[PDB]
Amino acid sequence: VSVNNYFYYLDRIKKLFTYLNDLRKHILKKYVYTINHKRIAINYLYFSMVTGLSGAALATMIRLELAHPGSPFFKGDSLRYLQVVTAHGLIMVFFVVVPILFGGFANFLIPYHVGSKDVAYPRLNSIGFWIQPCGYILLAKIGFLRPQFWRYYDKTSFSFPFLEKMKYNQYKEYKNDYLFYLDFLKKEITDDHSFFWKARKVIKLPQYSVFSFVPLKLMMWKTMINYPESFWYAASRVVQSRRKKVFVTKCSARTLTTAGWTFITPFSSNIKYTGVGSQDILILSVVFAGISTTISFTNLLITRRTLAMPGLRHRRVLMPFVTISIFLTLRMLATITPVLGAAVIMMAFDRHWQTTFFEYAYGGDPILSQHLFWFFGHPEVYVLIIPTFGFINMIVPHNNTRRVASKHHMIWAIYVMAYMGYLVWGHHMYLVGLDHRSRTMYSTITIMISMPATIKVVNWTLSLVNGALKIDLPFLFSMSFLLLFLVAGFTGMWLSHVSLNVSMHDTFYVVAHFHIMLSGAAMTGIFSGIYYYFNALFGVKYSRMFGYMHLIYYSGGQWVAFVPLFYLGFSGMPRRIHDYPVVFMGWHSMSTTGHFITLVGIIFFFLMMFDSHIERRASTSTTLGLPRWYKRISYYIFKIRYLQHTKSKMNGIPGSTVRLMLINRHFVEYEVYE
């Protein structure tokens, strides 16, 4: 019969609560404790997006600081500018590109491309995926957090008196000595358990023998009787004074700064030069990053050596270019990581134990630290730029339905470039003044490195030709990546000249070279691979209009921000400068505008992701299961299927004749009729 339960509302509430509990359990299972490679890669990609947003914000702040001569943004905080520059560099290099590329691409593809079940150590993969956030956060908080916490207008003098434990040292003597302790009780009170603030203002008050300069915020100790807060509340912004002078020193802690991406000794390797703070934080973050990189490299390389499929045991030519580049870069990272870790440990020991590991006085030499950093330096960039070439090569072959130009030659060239990258250490330290033989050897090795790159460019160009071009959004990104890589190679080759390098070492030319090589080529290739594999990663087809807008604004912004930088480099603008002469204002403003356009393009890409999520339409492989028409029957079948799918898709669209008639009769606004 009918049941009259008083609260169907409570029934529905119980249903909702059960839904919430089951949702929490399912979220913990498939998004927290999951060992799925796809889920781990998706999480890593989201974290990488967040980190890249933070890095782009740091870059935008740097660009705003450099926009106008006279330090309009940072207000002369040179230490803050240096910290922000180091933070941007580290977050983009060690926390954005490496995290995104390694985590996302490897986790998504190694299960598929290498054809292995999950990862070699799924527990380690999950551990690294969950561990990257700590370093991500740590490296991004240095610019806003400093040991000198008080503000420039913060009158720390009012509160620091309470921090002084030496004020009551006298009673410390009689704490364990009671024979004459009462004698100390016979003294006259002057500053015992009392605080007398000297007159902070010129008060001409004849009737007042004493003027209480005590903080008004601490008048009634009863209020402070239970407040579990420090006295800094009285010291935090209790004055209306402001010093809007660029000459006014806003730090007074000049030793507290950062030493950029490459730690430069002894400036970084001395407490007198680099105070306790950002330097130590960066060293610890580098140690953590090295541990995480070792973990990731073990998890990746262990599978490739062991978990290979029955047919992909040794013939690496069969694997995709992106996966081959992944394996090669993993080996390269496994090479230099121990050296980087040892160098970081030595730098930390010098900073905190004073081993004189960089002091020229009793045996040390900053050249050793510079050489170690460079031995970690050039291979890092070489490994970083490697995967994007494989991504572009994989994107191009499917779009043109043709075989690659020279797969074996390209693989061998990549391996040779990786081998050669271990011998360009002296190239980045040409001005350090090494032995002329060493400088000549370094220059000769640097010049010879371009031999593999030309092979790759020729192979890409040749594979792009004599094919069946099917233009997709991915193809335009690959073309943009190739165009960006064209200029960077020329800039690097020009910088390889000894005289030109001596004329432009550590300048805006080098800054432009580095940015166009990394920010342009690598990020463009990452975006291309994202668009090339948008379906498998997201499950829905991409949004054509917003994707085109992103590919347009992002490609233009890179050139817009790198052309003025190269122009200033030809004018000899020093790198890592907080301000410049007025002669550089035009180029600086152009670079800043380019950076803003790049930010707008990033916003457009985010809107593209949102639109793709709102679209919810299934994607169809343009190859239709036949990426190569290696046979006439295959070509005929592809043509027939394409014609059928076109006829089905072009259904309900008005016919050619009817559309022409309507278009011709469109104008229907006449004055007088018959």
Give min distance, CB of 41 to ligand HEA, in A. Answer: 12
Span interacting with Mg ion, options 370-378, 426-434, 520-528, 554-562, rule CB under 5 A = 426-434
Q: Does 513 bind Cu ion (CB under 5 A)?
A: no
Q: Would the annotation count 261 as a binding residue? A: yes
The token pair that represents 448 in the structure block: 């010879």
In whole angstroms, how far apart are CA 117 and each of 32, 82, 161, 178? Answer: 20, 46, 64, 76
Q: Does residue 237 sit in helix, strand or coil?
A: coil
With CB under 5 to 8 Å by kind, the binding choice for 514 among Cu ion, Mg ion, ligand HEA, none is ligand HEA
Shortest Å distance, C-beta 658 to other proteins: 6
What are the contacts of 235-242 at 24+ separation with CB within 8 A? Answer: 235/150, 235/154, 235/155, 235/156, 235/157, 235/158, 235/159, 235/160, 236/151, 236/154, 237/151, 237/153, 237/154, 238/155, 238/158, 239/153, 239/155, 241/153, 242/153
Least separation in angstroms between CB 223 and ligand HEA: 47
Question: How would you write 246-291 as a 3-class SS string?
Answer: CCCCCCCCCCCCCCCCCCCCCCCCCCCCCCCCHHHHHHHHHHHHHH
Q: Show contacts with other proteins in window 463-492 (CB under 8 A).
A: none
- b/e map 217-241, b = 16+ CB within 10 Å: bbeeeeeeeeeeeebbebbbeeeee
Neighbour tally for 144: CB within 10 Å:
10
Decide if residue 219 touches other proteins (CB under 8 A): no
Sign for the CA dihedral angle at 44, 46, 47, 51 comes to: positive
CB atoms within 10 A of CB 251: 16
Q: How far is residue 217's CA from residue 597's CA, in Å, rounded to a whole number? A: 48
- Binding-site size for other proteins (CB under 8 A) equals 110
Interface with ligand HEA (CB under 6 A): 49, 52-53, 55-56, 59, 62-63, 66, 85, 88-89, 92-93, 97, 260-261, 381, 384-385, 427-428, 446, 449-450, 453-454, 457, 486, 489-490, 492-493, 495-496, 501, 505-506, 510-511, 513-515, 517-519, 523, 526-527, 530, 561, 575-577, 595, 598, 602
Question: 180: helix, coil or strand?
Answer: coil
Please tell me whether 314 is known to bind a ligand.
Answer: no
Instruction: State the nearest-atom distance from the C-beta of 431 to Mg ion, in Å.
Output: 5
- Among 43, 48, 54, 270, contact with other proteins (rule: CB under 8 A): 54
Q: How far is the CB of 21 from other proteins (least distance, A)?
A: 5
556 binds other proteins (CB under 8 A): no
Which residues, numbered 239-258, are part of the site for other proteins (CB under 8 A)?
Answer: 240-247
Rg of the chain taking only CA atoms, in angstroms: 32
382 is in an annotated binding site: yes
Which does residue 78 bind out of other proteins, Cu ion, ligand HEA, none, counting CB within 5 to 8 angstroms by kind?
none
214 binds other proteins (CB under 8 A): no
Is 609 near other proteins (CB under 8 A)? yes
Four-residue CA torsion sign, 335, 375, 265, 504: negative
Among 540, 577, 626, 637, binds other proteins (CB under 8 A): 540
Q: Which option in Mg ion, Cu ion, other proteins, none does residue 506 bind, with CB closer than 5 to 8 A by kind? A: Mg ion
- Burial of residue 591 (CB within 10 Å: 0-12, 13-18, 19+) is buried
449 binds, among Cu ion, ligand HEA, Mg ion, none (CB under 5 to 8 A by kind): ligand HEA
Q: Which residues contact 615 (CB under 8 A, 6 or more apart)?
A: 540, 541, 543
Options 363-371, 402-410, 517-525, 536-544: segment touching other proteins (CB under 8 A): 536-544
Q: How far is the CB of 143 from ligand HEA (least distance, A)?
A: 13
Is 505 one of the annotated binding-site residues? yes
Q: What is the CA angle 265-269-275, rounded to 5?
A: 125
* Annotated binding-site residue? 207: no
Q: Which is nearer to Cu ion, 139 or 423 (CB)?
A: 423
Q: Binding to Cu ion (CB under 5 A): which residues in 373-392?
A: 378
When the beta carbons of 435 and 669 are compared against other proteins, the nearer one is: 669
Strand partners, 629: none
Indicate which of Cu ion, other proteins, Mg ion, none lies near residue 668 (CB less than 5 to 8 Å, by partner kind): other proteins
Those residues whose C-beta lies under 8 Å from the C-beta of residue 373, and which sit 6 or more positions away, are 262, 263, 264, 343
> Does 597 help bind other proteins (rule: CB under 8 A)?
yes
Interface pick for Mg ion out of 11, 164, 191, 506 (rule CB under 5 A): 506
Residue closer to ligand HEA, measured from CB, 526 or 549: 526
Indicate whether 648 belongs to the interface with other proteins (CB under 8 A): yes
> Quick check: 214 and 231 in contact, CB under 8 A?
no
Q: How far apart are CA 522 and CA 329, in angstroms?
A: 14
Tokens representing 364 are: 């040390």
With a CB cutoff of 8 Å and minimum separation 6, the contacts of 126 are: 33, 34, 35, 40
* Residues near Cu ion (CB under 5 A): 378, 428
* Residues near Mg ion (CB under 5 A): 431, 505-506
Q: Which residues are annotated as a binding site?
A: 63, 65, 68, 81, 88, 261, 378, 382, 427-428, 501, 505-506, 513, 515, 519, 553, 558, 575-578
Q: Which residues are annotated as a binding site for Mg(2+)?
A: 505-506
